[PDB]
Design a protein around this motif. Structure first.
Motif, PDB file in Angstrom:
ATOM      1  N   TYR A   6      38.364  41.837  -3.445  1.00 22.22           N
ATOM      2  CA  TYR A   6      38.487  42.721  -4.597  1.00 22.22           C
ATOM      3  C   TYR A   6      39.934  43.158  -4.804  1.00 22.22           C
ATOM      4  O   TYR A   6      40.671  43.406  -3.846  1.00 22.22           O
ATOM      5  CB  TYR A   6      37.588  43.945  -4.432  1.00 22.22           C
ATOM      6  CG  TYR A   6      36.225  43.787  -5.071  1.00 22.22           C
ATOM      7  CD1 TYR A   6      36.022  44.118  -6.408  1.00 22.22           C
ATOM      8  CD2 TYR A   6      35.143  43.311  -4.340  1.00 22.22           C
ATOM      9  CE1 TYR A   6      34.778  43.973  -6.998  1.00 22.22           C
ATOM     10  CE2 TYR A   6      33.896  43.165  -4.921  1.00 22.22           C
ATOM     11  CZ  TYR A   6      33.719  43.498  -6.250  1.00 22.22           C
ATOM     12  OH  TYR A   6      32.480  43.350  -6.828  1.00 22.22           O
ATOM     13  N   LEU A   7      40.331  43.254  -6.071  1.00 24.49           N
ATOM     14  CA  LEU A   7      41.673  43.657  -6.463  1.00 24.49           C
ATOM     15  C   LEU A   7      41.585  44.668  -7.599  1.00 24.49           C
ATOM     16  O   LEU A   7      40.554  44.803  -8.262  1.00 24.49           O
ATOM     17  CB  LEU A   7      42.523  42.452  -6.890  1.00 24.49           C
ATOM     18  CG  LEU A   7      42.991  41.501  -5.788  1.00 24.49           C
ATOM     19  CD1 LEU A   7      43.107  40.084  -6.322  1.00 24.49           C
ATOM     20  CD2 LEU A   7      44.316  41.967  -5.206  1.00 24.49           C
ATOM     21  N   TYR A   8      42.682  45.385  -7.819  1.00 28.09           N
ATOM     22  CA  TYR A   8      42.747  46.397  -8.869  1.00 28.09           C
ATOM     23  C   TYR A   8      44.202  46.539  -9.301  1.00 28.09           C
ATOM     24  O   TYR A   8      45.052  45.705  -8.968  1.00 28.09           O
ATOM     25  CB  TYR A   8      42.182  47.753  -8.412  1.00 28.09           C
ATOM     26  CG  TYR A   8      42.815  48.370  -7.174  1.00 28.09           C
ATOM     27  CD1 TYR A   8      43.633  49.489  -7.288  1.00 28.09           C
ATOM     28  CD2 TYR A   8      42.545  47.889  -5.896  1.00 28.09           C
ATOM     29  CE1 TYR A   8      44.207  50.074  -6.174  1.00 28.09           C
ATOM     30  CE2 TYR A   8      43.120  48.463  -4.779  1.00 28.09           C
ATOM     31  CZ  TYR A   8      43.943  49.559  -4.923  1.00 28.09           C
ATOM     32  OH  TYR A   8      44.504  50.135  -3.808  1.00 28.09           O
ATOM     33  N   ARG A   9      44.487  47.601 -10.052  1.00 30.50           N
ATOM     34  CA  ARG A   9      45.841  47.952 -10.457  1.00 30.50           C
ATOM     35  C   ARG A   9      46.096  49.417 -10.142  1.00 30.50           C
ATOM     36  O   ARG A   9      45.195  50.253 -10.268  1.00 30.50           O
ATOM     37  CB  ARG A   9      46.070  47.703 -11.950  1.00 30.50           C
ATOM     38  CG  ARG A   9      45.957  46.252 -12.384  1.00 30.50           C
ATOM     39  CD  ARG A   9      46.788  45.979 -13.632  1.00 30.50           C
ATOM     40  NE  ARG A   9      46.438  46.863 -14.738  1.00 30.50           N
ATOM     41  CZ  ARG A   9      47.232  47.803 -15.234  1.00 30.50           C
ATOM     42  NH1 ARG A   9      48.445  48.009 -14.749  1.00 30.50           N
ATOM     43  NH2 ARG A   9      46.796  48.556 -16.239  1.00 30.50           N
ATOM     44  N   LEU A  10      47.327  49.725  -9.729  1.00 32.67           N
ATOM     45  CA  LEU A  10      47.689  51.104  -9.424  1.00 32.67           C
ATOM     46  C   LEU A  10      49.093  51.466  -9.899  1.00 32.67           C
ATOM     47  O   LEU A  10      49.583  52.550  -9.556  1.00 32.67           O
ATOM     48  CB  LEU A  10      47.560  51.394  -7.913  1.00 32.67           C
ATOM     49  CG  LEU A  10      48.543  50.853  -6.863  1.00 32.67           C
ATOM     50  CD1 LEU A  10      48.362  51.616  -5.559  1.00 32.67           C
ATOM     51  CD2 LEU A  10      48.401  49.356  -6.603  1.00 32.67           C
ATOM     52  N   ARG A  68      41.503  45.505 -21.176  1.00 33.34           N
ATOM     53  CA  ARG A  68      41.791  45.079 -19.816  1.00 33.34           C
ATOM     54  C   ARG A  68      43.187  44.475 -19.742  1.00 33.34           C
ATOM     55  O   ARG A  68      43.738  44.014 -20.745  1.00 33.34           O
ATOM     56  CB  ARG A  68      40.765  44.058 -19.324  1.00 33.34           C
ATOM     57  CG  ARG A  68      39.357  44.603 -19.228  1.00 33.34           C
ATOM     58  CD  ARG A  68      38.411  43.555 -18.687  1.00 33.34           C
ATOM     59  NE  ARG A  68      38.414  42.347 -19.502  1.00 33.34           N
ATOM     60  CZ  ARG A  68      37.685  42.178 -20.596  1.00 33.34           C
ATOM     61  NH1 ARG A  68      36.870  43.123 -21.036  1.00 33.34           N
ATOM     62  NH2 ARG A  68      37.773  41.031 -21.263  1.00 33.34           N
ATOM     63  N   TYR A  83      45.298  53.930 -14.818  1.00 33.14           N
ATOM     64  CA  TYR A  83      45.840  52.611 -14.534  1.00 33.14           C
ATOM     65  C   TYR A  83      44.846  51.482 -14.755  1.00 33.14           C
ATOM     66  O   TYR A  83      45.273  50.350 -15.002  1.00 33.14           O
ATOM     67  CB  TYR A  83      46.346  52.549 -13.085  1.00 33.14           C
ATOM     68  CG  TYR A  83      47.432  53.555 -12.768  1.00 33.14           C
ATOM     69  CD1 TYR A  83      48.379  53.912 -13.721  1.00 33.14           C
ATOM     70  CD2 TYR A  83      47.499  54.159 -11.517  1.00 33.14           C
ATOM     71  CE1 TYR A  83      49.371  54.835 -13.436  1.00 33.14           C
ATOM     72  CE2 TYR A  83      48.486  55.086 -11.222  1.00 33.14           C
ATOM     73  CZ  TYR A  83      49.418  55.418 -12.185  1.00 33.14           C
ATOM     74  OH  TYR A  83      50.401  56.336 -11.898  1.00 33.14           O
ATOM     75  N   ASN A  84      43.544  51.753 -14.674  1.00 31.54           N
ATOM     76  CA  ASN A  84      42.525  50.729 -14.857  1.00 31.54           C
ATOM     77  C   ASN A  84      41.676  50.949 -16.099  1.00 31.54           C
ATOM     78  O   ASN A  84      41.630  50.079 -16.975  1.00 31.54           O
ATOM     79  CB  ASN A  84      41.623  50.662 -13.617  1.00 31.54           C
ATOM     80  CG  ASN A  84      42.326  50.064 -12.416  1.00 31.54           C
ATOM     81  OD1 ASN A  84      42.270  48.856 -12.186  1.00 31.54           O
ATOM     82  ND2 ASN A  84      42.993  50.911 -11.638  1.00 31.54           N
ATOM     83  N   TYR A  85      41.026  52.107 -16.215  1.00 31.73           N
ATOM     84  CA  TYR A  85      40.121  52.379 -17.327  1.00 31.73           C
ATOM     85  C   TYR A  85      39.902  53.880 -17.422  1.00 31.73           C
ATOM     86  O   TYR A  85      39.422  54.495 -16.466  1.00 31.73           O
ATOM     87  CB  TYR A  85      38.781  51.649 -17.133  1.00 31.73           C
ATOM     88  CG  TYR A  85      37.638  52.148 -17.995  1.00 31.73           C
ATOM     89  CD1 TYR A  85      37.523  51.757 -19.325  1.00 31.73           C
ATOM     90  CD2 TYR A  85      36.654  52.982 -17.468  1.00 31.73           C
ATOM     91  CE1 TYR A  85      36.472  52.201 -20.110  1.00 31.73           C
ATOM     92  CE2 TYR A  85      35.605  53.430 -18.244  1.00 31.73           C
ATOM     93  CZ  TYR A  85      35.518  53.037 -19.562  1.00 31.73           C
ATOM     94  OH  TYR A  85      34.469  53.485 -20.332  1.00 31.73           O
ATOM     95  N   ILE A 122      42.501  55.964 -11.287  1.00 29.58           N
ATOM     96  CA  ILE A 122      41.566  55.023 -11.893  1.00 29.58           C
ATOM     97  C   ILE A 122      41.472  55.335 -13.383  1.00 29.58           C
ATOM     98  O   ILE A 122      41.238  54.442 -14.205  1.00 29.58           O
ATOM     99  CB  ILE A 122      40.193  55.071 -11.181  1.00 29.58           C
ATOM    100  CG1 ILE A 122      39.244  53.989 -11.707  1.00 29.58           C
ATOM    101  CG2 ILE A 122      39.551  56.457 -11.264  1.00 29.58           C
ATOM    102  CD1 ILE A 122      39.523  52.619 -11.148  1.00 29.58           C
TER     103      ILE A 122
END
Lengths: 120, 50, 104
Positions: free
Chosen positions: B35-39, B50, B5-7, B2
């Protein structure tokens, strides 16, 4: 989900060897099914993982053109046929549902390798 | 995963992070698929975008 | 293809010591972390979910420390049921490794 692998095959060369694996429960598409080979005098090594609906069937080195892998669209059973039997083909084959990308729900990146071949 | 890859969070930053439990606000019987994210990312992250 | 080599698996320790099982790396990957264990005659078992996570159903005996070109399995205190073979998992094309473990 629980994996049951096929029984023993013929040890005599001159024909093909077939390994089958059935995933009873949790028959979900796009989950890769990987096959691994274990020897008494050699460690385990990867050959291939089959994806049912995407159609990608990426292999590894030193056995290309000799393997045919098929699977039902709704997982269920999977078959691998390997020809050109030789004198160094004594081993045991295990199968595990390899955890890859799921397009239908994006749910699990890697659930945990709990299902395996019982051993025949 | 996290923090790359995200913040990420700078070492010298003002304020802090408040967190709680969202079992009564996010859990649903039909599954949590909205819900979605990036990895996946080739490199690290510059601050605050972002 | 290529071979992802390793240190030899002739590792042994007494009860109450620290085991230093070593899996090397020529590259670096993040989401492909995970180890397998295999006793002779039984089905393989997953050891760790990733480098920073453990299996649901394992104690804190096995610890997998690794973030770059080195990977270690470390034991705080050994167990009589540790006699198996351990294999690290690296790379998307998955070159498997060699493992052997026996206390002596």
């Amino acid at each position: 989900v629980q994996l049951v692998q096929s029984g023993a095959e013929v040890k005599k060369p001159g024909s093909s060897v077939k390994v089958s694996c059935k995933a009873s429960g949790g028959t979900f598409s796009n989950y890769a099914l990987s096959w691994v080979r274990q020897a008494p005098g050699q460690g385990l090594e990867w050959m291939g993982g089959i994806i049912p609906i995407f159609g990608t069937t990426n292999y590894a080195q030193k056995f290309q053109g000799r393997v045919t892998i098929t699977a039902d669209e709704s997982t269920s059973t999977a078959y691998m046929e390997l020809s050109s039997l030789r004198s160094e083909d004594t081993a045991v084959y295990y199968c595990a549902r390899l955890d890859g990308y799921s397009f239908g729900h994006d749910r699990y990146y890697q659930d945990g390798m709990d299902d395996w071949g019982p051993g025949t | 995963n996290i923090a790359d890859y995200n913040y990420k969070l700078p070492d010298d930053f003002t304020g802090c992070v408040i967190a709680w439990n969202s079992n009564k606000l996010d859990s649903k019987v039909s599954g949590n698929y909205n819900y979605l994210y990036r990895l996946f990312r080739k490199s690290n992250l510059k601050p605050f975008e972002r | 293809d290529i071979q992802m080599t390793q240190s030899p698996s002739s590792l042994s320790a007494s009860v109450g010591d620290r085991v230093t099982i070593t899996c090397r790396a020529s590259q670096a990957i993040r989401n492909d972390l995970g180890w397998y264990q295999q006793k002779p005659g039984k089905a393989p078992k997953c050891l760790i979910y990733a480098a920073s996570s453990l299996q649901s159903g394992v104690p804190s005996r096995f610890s997998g420390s690794g973030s770059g070109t080195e990977f270690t399995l470390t034991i705080s205190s050994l167990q009589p049921e540790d006699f198996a073979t351990y294999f690290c998992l690296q790379q998307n094309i998955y070159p498997r490794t060699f493992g052997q473990g026996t206390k002596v």
